[PDB]
Design a protein around this nucleic acid. Structure first.
Lengths: 107, 170, 340, 62
RNA sequence: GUGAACAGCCUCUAGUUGAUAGAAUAAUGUAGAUAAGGGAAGUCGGCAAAAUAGAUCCGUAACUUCGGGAUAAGGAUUGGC
RNA sequence: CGUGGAGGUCAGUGACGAAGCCUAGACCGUAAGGUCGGGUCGAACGGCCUCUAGUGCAGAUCUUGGUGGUAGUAGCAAAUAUUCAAAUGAGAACUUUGAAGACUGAAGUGGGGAAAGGUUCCACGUCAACAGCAGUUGGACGUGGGUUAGUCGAUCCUAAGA
């Protein structure tokens, strides 16, 4: 199904204990795994603005909580093996605390 | 032609060959023995799963001091690996053999790997002590499955005993 | 170096350590279980008002570390008879109860979620019209068995554990003739046995468990995760789950249960019966532990002296806990910003 | 495309380092057709190649 | 810029992002640290670590070839406004 | 008993298959060895009487060449550090562009020379080998283009010396 949701990912507990030189690359991989877990798609594409937010404070300064918008969409190329894929984009909020998973009514 | 020892009908077979291939002989021997005798579709799906690290290739001879893995349990071994280069070469050869069978007009659902063989190609050297590669020759044959007087020298006494039995019976 | 009797230092074959010796039986006594199953749930501290003549601490109060073992009642689900042979004890017959919970039926599967759950479904058909086969097997046990053990399982669903698969064990029945043992088992099929019908306060018990695992250590090799049998641990309290004021003594009138503030760390609250045992026992939190009766009639005045507890520490174990109850914490701090 | 030569020529033509020239990721074929300094100059004029501004080193705290 | 300073540390112009990668995080090894109480009891042997360290003010012994010893030793101070 | 070559002879064997090699096959001899069948192969070769010698190997830390086990094992842990998207392409962790994060930090990972090297410079094409993974990249390979002086040097002068 074509669907769009907004999630909060707790990067603090997913990055607990990771070496400082690996925190932001590990966050990239964790977000890919998180999107795969929630949408079922093995093809996760991250927005460069999302990567910018991840790397905002250097390689070892990733934020504790991140508000994401994940859109599972149809692969309209008809070339890739997976029928669907997920696109992860950042959501700009003052604070990422206290927010629950919501459904976006795309219009 | 000029393949290894094969005991199969040529008219129901197709062949594929690859020589001087820049891939490890030991790894490729393990891959080929993993495939030997399987159905063609089963082997192809298996090699895809190996590429995806969901199933492994058991290493039975060239397996000294390699890692142990739960994915060996399928074949009763404890040592299995995922040789990507070997898998790619072998599945290229499988695709070539399947195409040859299609051109020959063989029924692709009955095809199984009836022969597969890896031996060593001439070594290629580089220097940076010997520093050589171990290339492979690979050959394989896929074949269709097909469903499905001794005179005796008795002595005179033996013949007499047989006749006595016959007379005693009906 | 090391005690050569604990060789080889290899991993225990199971997570549940085996009871390798039950107390010597005395047939004149009533029928009793020799052992019980529990789950280790953290430690805490108590103040004991000591009455020990001869000691420098006679008529004085001491502070002791204690272990709390969560012990919801066990379910009796079977009986097994043993015959002695020139080659040792041999099991002759196992008889099961008619109905078994999913808690114990999970023990017989590697992949419960994927199964048809057919276990014991054909066995239950023996209790069909007369129970003649069940009665014949019980008669066989009564006639030939020299040792009778009962099959029990824990109620792990009553614990805070994520595991749904119950632990199953044999517990020797001591006291009474063989026929009386078998009758007791048959009467208790599908029934629960509580920890206070097995043990009582002031009694010395033994703790059998597999110790904390430490992996590879530098000869080098496996360290920890060994079966151990520690003896002579005194029971300071047999508490009740349905009892409020589990942690309240005659000297401390605060109505509070045994559970520390914030819960035990890596283990939830205690909502069942429990055993408070003086000192430490092998294993770590959440480990299944076996509590055994003393093998011998203890000749120590320690096994005889009654335990009078003055206070049980229910402060938080998740930090430097200062308050026994949240009411005390609120009364100390006062009114916070979000209270208004 | 390989715009290594185009990046070098844009640096020379604008007079700044290669670290200060911007090549439009959308006009890739158009830039790839630019093999001459005159073509680079035309692309600079119409904005396909842009000189970036210097990284600020302010002396306010000093 | 800091600072006595072509020191160390951070930045602008210019240049580079090269070094086989991925997943785990047991012991051991190497490098770098911390530690109750005691304080050389260790060892052939205080080996190695620790402690000291800039600048201002005070103050400075024996010996001396009168030039030194000397930053002798030993004290006080250091931010912001 | 066996080998290279020489004189004589068997009007010896042979493309209808000499020699050689392989053989789970056969026979003779105490043995050195000899003979036959089958396969493979393609141009020469044998028996006997004699002549002649660079004439018989398990060794010599033997010579030259080839090849194993070790072993898919040791190892590719300095140089703080990479990441997202698109393009190209059969194929992209490594090419190109954009976006981020870092670094050398003016005694530079910046810009020039002497000497040395010799085309490495630039473009187009290309990946069999090489750049100790990869590669669509390259100081690699193929093909072309490129170095302009009265004033910058040499050339002139003398030095130690020859």
């Amino acid at each position: 199904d074509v669907v769009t949701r907004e999630y909060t990912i707790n990067l603090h507990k997913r990055l607990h204990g990771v070496s400082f030189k690996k925190r932001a690359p590990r966050a990239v991989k964790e977000i890919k795994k998180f999107a795969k877990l929630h949408m079922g798609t093995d093809d996760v594409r991250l927005a460069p603005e999302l990567n910018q937010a991840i790397w905002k404070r250097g390689v070892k300064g990733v934020e504790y909580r991140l508000r994401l918008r994940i859109s599972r969409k149809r692969n309209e190329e008809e070339d890739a093996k997976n029928p669907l894929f997920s696109y992860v984009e950042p959501v700009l909020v003052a604070s990422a605390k206290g927010l629950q998973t919501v459904v976006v009514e795309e219009d | 032609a000029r393949y290894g020892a094969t005991s199969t009908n040529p008219a129901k077979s197709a062949s594929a060959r690859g020589s001087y291939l820049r891939v490890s002989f030991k790894n490729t021997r393990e891959t080929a023995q993993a495939i030997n005798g399987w159905e063609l579709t089963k082997a192809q799906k298996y090699l895809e799963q190996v590429l995806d690290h969901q199933r492994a290739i058991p290493f039975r001879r060239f397996n000294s001091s390699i890692g142990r893995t739960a994915q060996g349990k399928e074949f009763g071994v404890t040592k299995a690996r995922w040789p990507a280069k070997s898998v790619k070469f072998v599945q290229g050869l499988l695709q070539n053999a399947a195409a040859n069978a299609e051109a020959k007009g063989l029924d692709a659902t009955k095809l199984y790997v009836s022969h597969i063989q890896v031996n060593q190609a001439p070594k290629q050297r580089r220097r940076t002590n010997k520093y050589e590669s171990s290339p492979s020759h690979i050959e394989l044959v896929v074949t269709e499955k097909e469903e499905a007087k001794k005179v005796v020298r008795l002595t005179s006494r033996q013949r007499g005993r047989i006749a006595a039995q016959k007379r005693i019976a009906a | 170096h090391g005690h050569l009797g604990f060789l080889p230092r290899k991993r225990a074959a199971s997570i549940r350590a085996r009871v390798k010796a039950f107390p010597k039986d005395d047939r004149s006594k009533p029928v009793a279980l020799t052992s019980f199953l529990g789950y280790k749930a953290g430690m805490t501290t108590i103040v004991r008002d000591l009455d020990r003549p001869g000691s420098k601490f006679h008529k004085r109060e001491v502070v002791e570390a204690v272990t709390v073992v969560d012990t919801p009642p066990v379910v009796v689900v079977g009986v097994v008879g043993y015959v002695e042979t020139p080659r040792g004890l041999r099991s002759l017959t196992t008889v099961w109860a008619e109905h078994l919970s999913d808690e114990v039926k999970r023990r017989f599967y590697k992949n419960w979620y994927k199964s048809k759950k057919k276990a014991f479904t054909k066995y239950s058909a023996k209790y069909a019209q007369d129970g003649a086969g069940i009665e014949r097997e019980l008669a066989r046990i009564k006639k030939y068995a020299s040792v009778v053990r009962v099959l029990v399982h824990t109620q792990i669903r009553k614990t805070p554990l994520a595991q749904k698969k119950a632990h199953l064990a044999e517990i020797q029945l001591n006291g009474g003739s063989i026929s009386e043992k078998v009758d007791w088992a048959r009467e208790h099929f599908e029934k629960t046995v509580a920890v206070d019908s097995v043990f009582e306060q002031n009694e010395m018990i033994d703790a059998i468990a597999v110790t904390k695992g430490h992996g590879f250590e530098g000869r080098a090799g496996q360290r920890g995760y060994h079966s151990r049998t520690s003896i002579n641990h005194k029971i300071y309290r047999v508490g009740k789950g349905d009892d409020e004021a589990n942690g309240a003594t005659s000297f401390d009138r605060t109505k509070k249960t045994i559970t520390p503030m914030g819960g035990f760390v890596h283990y939830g609250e205690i909502k069942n019966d429990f055993i408070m045992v003086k000192g430490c026992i092998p294993g770590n939190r959440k480990r299944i532990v076996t509590l055994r009766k003393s093998l011998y009639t203890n000749t120590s005045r320690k096994a005889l002296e009654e335990v009078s507890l003055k206070w049980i520490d229910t402060a938080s174990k998740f930090g430097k806990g200062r308050f026994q109850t949240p009411a005390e914490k609120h009364a100390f701090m006062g009114t916070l910003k979000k209270d208004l | 495309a390989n715009l290594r030569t185009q990046k070098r020529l844009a640096a020379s033509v604008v007079g700044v380092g290669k670290r200060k020239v911007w090549l439009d990721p959308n006009e890739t074929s158009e830039i790839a057709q630019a093999n001459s300094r005159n073509a680079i100059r035309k692309l600079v004029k119409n904005g396909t190649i842009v000189k970036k501004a210097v990284t600020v080193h302010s002396k306010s705290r000093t």
